[PDB]
Each structure stands twice: as C-alpha cells, then as structure tokens.
Amino acid sequence: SVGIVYGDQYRQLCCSSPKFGDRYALVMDLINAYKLIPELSRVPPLQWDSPSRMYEAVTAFHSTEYVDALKKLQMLHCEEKELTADDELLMDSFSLNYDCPGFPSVFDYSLAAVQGSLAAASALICRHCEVVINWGGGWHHAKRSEASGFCYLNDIVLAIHRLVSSQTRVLYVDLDLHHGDGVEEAFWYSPRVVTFSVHHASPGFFPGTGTWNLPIFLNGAGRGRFSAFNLPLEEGINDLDWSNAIGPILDSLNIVIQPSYVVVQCGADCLATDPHRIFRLTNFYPSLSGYLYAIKKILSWKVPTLILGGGGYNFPDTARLWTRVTALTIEEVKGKKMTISPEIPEHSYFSRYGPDFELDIDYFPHEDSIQKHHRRILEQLRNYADLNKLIYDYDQVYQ
Ligand SMILES: O=C(NO)c1ccc(Cl)c(NC(=O)c2ccc(Cl)cc2Cl)c1
Ligand SMILES: [K+]
Ligand SMILES: [K+]
Ligand SMILES: [Zn+2]
C-alpha cells in the first residue's frame, strides 16, 4: 500500500510551532478534501515504552547532552519566569537561539517528527507499504549537538539509520531550496548512504555549504569518500531546466548504486510563489512541475521509498504541491488513476485558497555550467564505484 503518517495528537503537535503555524493541517485537509485519504494506509507515529527507549532512539544520532538541553528548554518555556544567565549560556552552546528559539512545545514538536519518520521507515522494512509519506517530517539541517534553520531533531538521519540497520544501501535525494547539510554530515564517512542535494547556493545564502569550497567540491571522507553529491544552481531556474539538470543524475545514481531504499526530502520552497522568490518551479501537471518530474522518475524505479516534507513558507501553495505529489504516488504505485479537479473543493480551509481557489499555483512562467557540473558529477560517480568496487556499464550511464 501507500502509507501516510497522521494522527490527532500528531497533527496537534505539528501545528504548535510559531514558525510553521497550521501548515500541516492545511496540507492534510487538502489531501482529505480531494478524497485521497481512503486510498492511503494510515501509519501511526512511533511511541516508546519508557524514557530510556526514547533516549536510546534519539541518541542514535544526537548527543545526550543536546537532548537534555532541548527538553530543559521546553520546561523553561512552560514557566513564566525568564532564563538565567547560566541557562542562556547553556542554550547558546547548542545554537538553541535566534533562528531556533524555544517555545512551550519545542521538544514534543521536534520529537513528533522523529516518531513519524521512524514509523514510516518501519512500515517499509516490514513491507506493509511500498512507499510512505510523512509531510510532518524532513528537518534536514539539525546536527548531532546543534539546532539549525528551525530544525531541532534530524528525523531524516534517524529514519535512514533505521533503514540501513535492517548489504543495505540507501539513496537520499534532497529537493529543498536549501542544501541538506545535516544529513550529508551525518553520513560523511559512510559509503552505504549516498546523499544527493540540489539547491540554491550563493555568497551569504543559508546554510552556506553544498558548493565550491582553485576551490573544489568536498564529497565525503574515509570509506565515504565520493559518497556525498551536490548540484548548486543559480537563482531563477524554471521547471524544464531544473528537470534536465537533475534527471540524468538521478538515473545514473540509481543504476550505479542500486539502492535498497530511497529517501526523498521534498521541501516546497523552490516554488515560484514561495516568499524566498529564488527558484521558479511550479506544481503544474499538464510545463511540468520539476517536483512531479523527479518524484515520478524515482517511483518508476520500484524501490521502497520514503517521501518527506521540509521547507515551504507559502502554506496554501505548499498544500497544493504536496497534494499533487500524494496523488501521483498513488497512481504510480497502485496503477489507479487519480483525477484531481482544477478547482479547490469545499472544506474547512477553503477560504485560505483565495482569491481564485484553483489547484495550480498562481504563476505565469517564462525563460553549460550545468554541463560542467554533469561532467564533474559523473567523474565522482566513477570514483565512487571504483572505490567501492561496484559493477556497472559506463556506456549505459554515459548515455
Ligand atoms: O527552509 C529552510 N531550510 O530547509 C530554511 C532554513 C533557514 C532559513 Cl533562515 C530559512 N528562511 C526562512 O525562514 C524565511 C526566509 C525568507 C522569508 Cl521571506 C521567509 C522565511 Cl520563513 C529557511
Ligand atoms: K536540497
Ligand atoms: K555518504
Ligand atoms: Zn528550505
């Protein structure tokens, strides 16, 4: 079946942060208004049988002291009195500040996404589901002992760790506007988790990595050398050029790596209507949405797949994209056509889709360095396959 993570408590927690507000509710209610929920298997978030089992799961990646600080940060924000100087210094040492502030549910909110993405991995491992979707997950910037970019716990790293410990190889594909630095870093020394991020990069733009470092690309270390891939792209790119840029790379990686699982981060901040206003992708499904192109290509491999959310700050347009991604996944896996009306159906958040209440985002598209990146990346894939002694047809890949 196609699984999707949700639950009443889960929806409550995913909607409790100051930055992302009720985004997750809009996403799931649009999926519901288009009658997709009966097509999907509900995957409940993982719960644990003691505080010690919870800690053992989260500290598979994160340090115990970081977990301790994040839980203390929640407690402190549930009392009225403000922080002492010693507690502020403690939070500062884990970057629990500025872009990653505390709030009354910050720990349960962060943990919830971990619970969802670990349950999604389990449902793929036991073969209940061929694909699982978690639009509450995808928080790719969090590091072992540091919050970053409103990511407090790295649900993706923990999901991938569960997958690889079930020889298992995982291909991680990161479609967010931003470089997936936290996932890349976690698996920097690990050849069995190959990471590939396509993103904007330019001087001063967050988080800064995934690009030239004459400078060269770093790409892993130890036995993980050549196992971290990156494609940085200039601002203004449209669906067609983004699709051609990443399409051959995706197919080459699948052919050479032959992954046991694929994990996709599908942050929606590349949409032309995101307030970042950097890339110009759409949710269009005839100009074909770069996101839908990539997901369809990945699903055509027939490899068990985890699809996660991520960035996306125009909440109705994020709903519009992820609803179409969800219908596409049903069609590709079940072989059953999903027809989606071009008009938004009546439902509790209908008023949020004004002023025109259509499923297409409201955008009118327009519009050699990529050739050089393609040559560089193919060379790296050759180095990866040589180092790891893999068998593959150069002429099929070079094709
Ligand atoms: O999504 C992210 N990473 O995956 C991510 C990480 C760090 C930052 Cl600073 C941001 N940026 C924002 O939050 C933001 C920027 C401009 C505007 Cl107009 C509105 C917002 Cl909401 C996003
Ligand atoms: K990315
Ligand atoms: K790696
Ligand atoms: Zn982002």
Which residues have a Cβ under 8 Å from the Cβ of 329 and sit 6 or more positions away?
2, 131, 133, 295, 299, 307
Nearest CA-CA partner of 87 in 102, 99, 100:
102
Burial bucket for residue 55 (CB in 10 Å: 0-12, 13-18, 19+): middle
Q: Do 364 and 238 form a contact (C-beta atoms < 8 A)?
A: no
Q: What is the SS3 string spanning the chain? A: CEEEECCHHHHHHHCCCCCCCCHHHHHHHHHHHCCCHHHCEEECCCCCCCHHHHHHHHCCCCCHHHHHHHHHHHHHHHCCCCCCHHHHHHHHCCCCCCCCCCCCCHHHHHHHHHHHHHHHHHHHHCCCCCEEEECCCCCCCCECCECECCECCCHHHHHHHHHHCCCCCEEEEECCCCCCHHHHHHCCCCCCEEEEEEEECCCCCCCCCCCCCCCCCCCCCHHHCCCEEEEEECCCCEHHHHHHHHHHHHHHHHHHHCCCEEEEECCCCCECCCCCCCCEECCCCCCCCHHHHHHHHHHCCCCCEEEECCCCCCHHHHHHHHHHHHHHHHHHHHCCCCCCCCECCCCCCHHHHCCCCECCCCCCCCCCHHHHHHHHHHHHHHHHHHHCCCCCCHHHHHC
Testing ligand 1's pocket by substitution, the residue of 178, 235, 271 carrying the most ligand atoms inside 8 A of its CB is: 178
Tracing tokens 């051609």 back to the chain, one arrives at 244
Measuring from atom 22 of ligand 1, which residue has the nearest CA? 149
How many angstroms separate the CA atoms of 64 and 62, rounded? 7
Residue list, ligand 1 pocket, CB within 6 Å: 99, 141, 149, 176, 178, 206, 267, 269, 275-276, 310-311, 313
Testing ligand 1's pocket by substitution, the residue of 313, 314, 315, 317 carrying the most ligand atoms inside 8 A of its CB is: 313
Tracing tokens 């125009």 back to the chain, one arrives at 314
- Which amino acid does the sequence have at 326? T
Q: Do 325 and 132 form a contact (C-beta atoms < 8 A)?
A: no
How many angstroms separate the CA atoms of 161 and 150, rounded? 22
Tokens matching residue 236: 């203004």
Tokens matching residue 224: 């993980």
- Which amino acid does the sequence have at 148? S
Strands 170-174 and 261-265: parallel
Please give the positions annotated as active site. Answer: 141
Beta bridge partners of 264: 173, 307
CA 166 to ligand 1 center in whole angstroms: 34
How many CB atoms lie under 10 A from the CB of residue 64?
Answer: 11
269 annotated as ligand-binding: yes
How many angstroms separate the CA atoms of 369 and 375, rounded? 10
Tokens matching residue 133: 């979707």
How many CB atoms lie under 10 A from the CB of residue 396?
Answer: 11
Strands 261-265 and 305-308: parallel
Beta bridge partners of 263: 172, 306
CA 84 to ligand 3 center in whole angstroms: 40
Burial bucket for residue 68 (CB in 10 Å: 0-12, 13-18, 19+): middle
First CA to last CA distance, the chain: 34
Nearest CA-CA partner of 129 in 25, 6, 4:
4
Q: Which resolution in angstroms does this entry have?
A: 2.0
How many angstroms separate the CA atoms of 27 and 300, rounded? 25
CA 280 to ligand 1 center in whole angstroms: 16
Q: Do 232 and 210 form a contact (C-beta atoms < 8 A)?
A: yes
Q: How many residues does the chain have?
A: 399
Q: Over the Cα atoms of the chain, what is R_g?
A: 20
How many angstroms separate the CA atoms of 253 and 194, rounded? 9
Burial bucket for residue 86 (CB in 10 Å: 0-12, 13-18, 19+): exposed
How many angstroms separate the CA atoms of 288 and 303, rounded? 23
**In order of start, what are the domains of the chain with their CATH numbers?**
1-399 (3.40.800.20)
CA-CA distances (angstroms) from residue 55 to 70, 76, 104, 113? Answer: 12, 20, 20, 15
How would you list the strands of the sheet with 261-265, edge to edge? 41-43, 2-5, 131-134, 305-308, 261-265, 170-174, 193-200, 228-233
Q: Do 196 and 219 form a contact (C-beta atoms < 8 A)?
A: no
How many CB atoms lie under 10 A from the CB of residue 167?
Answer: 6
CA 308 to ligand 1 center in whole angstroms: 17
How many CB atoms lie under 10 A from the CB of residue 170?
Answer: 24
Tokens matching residue 197: 């991020």
Whether the upstream peptide bond of residue 355 has omega within 30° of 0, thus cis, is yes
How many CB atoms lie under 10 A from the CB of residue 82?
Answer: 9
Which residues have a Cβ under 8 Å from the Cβ of 393 and sit 6 or more positions away?
255
Q: Do 180 and 310 form a contact (C-beta atoms < 8 A)?
A: no
- Which amino acid does the sequence have at 65? E
Residues whose CB is under 5 A from ligand 3 (ion)?
A: 187, 190, 193, 224, 227
How many angstroms separate the CA atoms of 71 and 66, rounded? 9
Tokens matching residue 226: 């050549």
239 annotated as ligand-binding: no
